[PDB]
Each structure stands twice: as structure tokens, then as C-alpha cells.
Amino acid sequence: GCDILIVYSPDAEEWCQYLQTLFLSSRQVRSQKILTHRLGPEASFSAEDLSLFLSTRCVVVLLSAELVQHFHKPSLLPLLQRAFHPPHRVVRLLCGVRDSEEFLDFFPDWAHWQELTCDDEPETYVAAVKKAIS
């Protein structure tokens, strides 16, 4: 590991615990190292942390309102571009944020991520991180 990294902000806390339990329940990914990193506003990342961002095999981005606010911090954005790459390794879950063309200004390969919604079947969630680590 790290194999699967769930990046989220505190407003999407429960979505994060939901996916953890689902991923640990499922045969395709239960066996993998599944870590989480909560973004803001209490902190930036520790040495051992920003490591994980760059080192993980697959990233799952919980797209909440509080999370995209971090896309607007220029000290931080360049790290996120290098972390959320390459696009076939990135999954986003829309958490009360409508998808948009503006995101292409922050992440140029945005359109090539795997996208999930709040009303997707659980099998869809797991198939996406299965496809992303494989």
C-alpha cells in the first residue's frame, strides 16, 4: 500500500465512512490497503501524509463543497494536480456538487475521471475502484 486513498472534507465525512465499510466488505478490494485523508481546515499535511497523496495507486475524490474550496488555494492546487493523476487512476464521487466545465481549469484531464453519484448502486462504486487499481 497505499492502494486506495479516499480524499474528503469533513462535510462528506459519512460518505467516507460508508465507502470504507463497503470497500472492506467487498471481495475485489477488501484485501487492499485503504487509507483516508481528511482535507482542512485544521491542517495541512504531515511528512507521512503528503507522501500518501503521491504514492497511492488509486485516488477516490469525494467532491463536496468544502473540498472544492481547497481547489482555490494556490499553495495547494499544484499538489492536487500531481496527486490526481493519471486520469484512469482517479475516481470522483459527486457529493452535493453538480459536475461542471469550470473544473477543467483546475484539472485538465477532469473529463477522463471515472465519475460516481450518490444514487449509484454499491456494485457500481466497487467496480469503479476495482477498474482503477487494475
Author numbering: 6 to 139
Sentences from the study reporting this entry:
One such adaptor, B-cell adaptor for phosphoinositide 3-kinase (BCAP),4 functions in linking the B-cell receptor (BCR) and the co-receptor CD19 to the activation of PI3K via interaction with the SH2 domains on the regulatory p85 subunit. Architecturally, BCAP contains well defined ankyrin repeats and a Dof/BANK/BCAP (DBB) domain; the latter was first reported in the Drosophila protein Dof, where it is required for FGF-dependent signaling, and a homologous domain exists in the B-cell scaffold with ankyrin repeat (BANK) protein. A recent study predicted the existence of a TIR domain in the N-terminal region of BCAPL that is required for negative regulation of inflammatory signaling by TLRs. Here we present the structure of the N-terminal domain of BCAP, firmly establishing it as a TIR domain.
The N-terminal domain of BCAP comprising residues 7–142 was solubly expressed in Escherichia coli. The structure was solved at 2.5 Å using data derived from protein crystals in which the lysine residues were dimethylated and single-wavelength anomalous dispersion phasing with 5-amino-2,4,6-triiodoisophthalic acid monohydrate. There was a single molecule in the asymmetric unit, and the structure reveals that the N-terminal region adopts a typical TIR domain fold. The TIR domain of BCAP is composed of five parallel β-strands (βA–βE) surrounded by five α-helices(αA–αE). The third α-helix has a kink and forms two helices, αC and αC′, and the fourth is distorted. The loop regions, with the exception of the biologically important BB-loop, which connects the βB-strand to the αB-helix, were well defined in the electron density, and unlike the structure of the MAL-TIR domain, there are no disulfide bonds. Strikingly, the orientation of the βB-sheet and the αB-helix of BCAP TIR domain is such that it extends out of the domain core in comparison with that of MAL/TIRAP. The electrostatic potential of the solvent-accessible surface of BCAP reveals distinct regions of negative and positive potential in addition to hydrophobic patches, suggesting that the TIR domain of BCAP may interact with diverse TIR domain-containing proteins. The isolated TIR domain of BCAP is monomeric both in the crystal and in solution, a feature shared with most non-plant TIR domains, suggesting that vertebrate TIR domain-containing proteins require other domains to promote self-oligomerization: leucine-rich repeats (LRRs) for the TLR, a death domain for MyD88, and the DBB domain and likely the ANK repeats for BCAP.
